[PDB]
Design an enzyme around this catalytic site. Structure first.
Site: not given
Ligand code: ZN
Length: 429
Positions: A228-229, A232, A268
């Site tokens: 998930h990171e 980003h 997000e």
């Molecule tokens: Zn996030």
């Protein structure tokens, strides 16, 4: 293909994959920090990280909640802790690398680089030291440390910041500049996290037949917390990050409190992916995509104007980096040699970065149970000894057949897998 490097925290510096770095960003560090190259331009510094002056890792006095938190000032304090953390990160990258999409994710993050520059860089210049894209390499001699050069990581993974269960990815800039990660250039990303501290939920993506009864609580697989990171980081590397002020007012419920309002960032929503993307007005989604395309056009223009580089030692390599960046952005080269942006190629790339490389998609591809939505209600976090192959392995994570935990994601089911334990209640807030 890509291979993940193996390390022991105690392994000697080799001026190649193990070095001491000074990022000039960790307020918790008073001396250079030992770093390890996972692969390519992805590095890991197994230390706690902070951006606050006079940092304190103890539980906050006031009320920062409803935000769920876990505070332990001694986590990652010893070399023994750092060794374990380092090995956990390495093992997770190997698992991520076990599926094609994960291999591609790692390949891109470890190969493509931020454009050398920002909004204030002259159009004819490549600046390899812009903002915080380059980090100092230090060596010790006597009772001091001296800079011997620098490196340009694309991603640096560090241990958690103050709140251990609030993983965070960030880029940094000098006061008078704007964020290059949101303007096509892209920039170095620092990911602060500890994947073994797993978020728990009951509103999951995979139906396991409990709909009419009492639903089980499941944990998030550590690779998804990390991936998930990494999403980003992908947005940051390709310069398509959405400003944090772009949000949709929503609600959720933490590990204690009841339904409370929160400003859900569009960043997000993209990192998570799935149907949630529809929460962003279609017109707004198009707006940011078109904005990114314009920033890309400006980059193409720069690539047709480069005549100098900083530092000067890079002047002889302008052609090399021009070619690398052309490949990164998937630009087209006219017979004349002019660099142009092909919309079709851009649209495809943008879609990949925002809708294919997503947590939601990874859950399906790696065949693991996961939260149905980013704002799924959460319960008490759990942890486990993920380095123990009898608990968590590269091929199946927690859902190991040998343990008879491969059916209906039982390995991730809190009441079916004793290897999962609630985190220490004392540090929780
Ligand atoms: Zn996030």
């Amino acid at each position: 293909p890509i291979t993940i490097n193996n390390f022991n925290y105690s392994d000697p510096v080799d001026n190649k994959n193990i070095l001491y770095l000074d990022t000039h960003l960790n307020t918790l560090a008073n001396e250079p920090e030992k770093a390890f190259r996972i692969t390519g331009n992805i590095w890991v510094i197994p230390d706690r990280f902070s951006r606050n002056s006079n940092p304190n890792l103890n539980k906050p006095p006031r009320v920062t909640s409803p935000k769920s938190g876990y505070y332990d000032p001694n986590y990652l304090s010893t070399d023994s802790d750092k060794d374990t953390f380092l090995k956990e990160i390495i093992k997770l990258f190997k698992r991520i690398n076990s599926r094609e999409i994960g291999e591609e994710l790692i390949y891109r993050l470890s190969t493509d680089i931020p454009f050398p520059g920002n909004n204030n860089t002259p159009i004819n210049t490549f600046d390899f030291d812009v903002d915080f894209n380059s980090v100092d390499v230090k060596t010790r001699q006597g009772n001091n440390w001296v800079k011997t050069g620098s490196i340009n990581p694309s991603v640096i993974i560090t241990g958690p910041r103050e709140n251990i269960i609030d993983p965070e990815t960030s880029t940094f800039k000098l006061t008078n500049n704007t964020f290059a990660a949101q303007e096509g250039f892209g920039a170095l990303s620092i990911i602060s996290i500890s994947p073994r501290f797993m978020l728990t939920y009951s509103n999951a993506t995979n139906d396991v037949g409990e709909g009419r009864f009492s639903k089980s609580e499941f944990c998030m697989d550590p690779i998804l917390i990390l991936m998930h990171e990494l999403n980003h980081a992908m947005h940051n590397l390709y310069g398509i990050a959405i400003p944090n002020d772009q949000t949709i007012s929503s609600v959720t419920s933490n590990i204690f409190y009841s339904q409370y309002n929160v400003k859900l960032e569009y960043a997000e929503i993209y990192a998570f992916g799935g149907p949630t993307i529809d929460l962003i007005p279609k017109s707004a989604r198009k707006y940011f995509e078109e904005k990114a395309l314009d920033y890309y056009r400006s980059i193409a223009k720069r690539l047709n104007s480069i005549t100098t580089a900083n530092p000067s030692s890079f002047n002889k390599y302008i052609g090399e980096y021009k070619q690398k960046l052309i490949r990164k952005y998937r630009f087209v080269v006219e017979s004349s040699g002019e660099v142009t942006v092909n919309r079709n190629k851009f649209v495809e790339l943008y879609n990949e970065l925002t809708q294919i490389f997503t947590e939601f998609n990874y859950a399906k591809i790696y065949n693991v149970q996961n939260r149905k939505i980013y704002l799924s209600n959460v319960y008490t976090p759990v942890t486990a000894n993920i380095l123990d192959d009898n608990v968590y392995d590269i091929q199946n994570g927690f859902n190991i057949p040998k343990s008879n935990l491969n059916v209906l994601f039982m390995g991730q089911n809190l009441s079916r897998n004793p290897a999962l334990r609630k985190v220490n209640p004392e540090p929780l807030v």
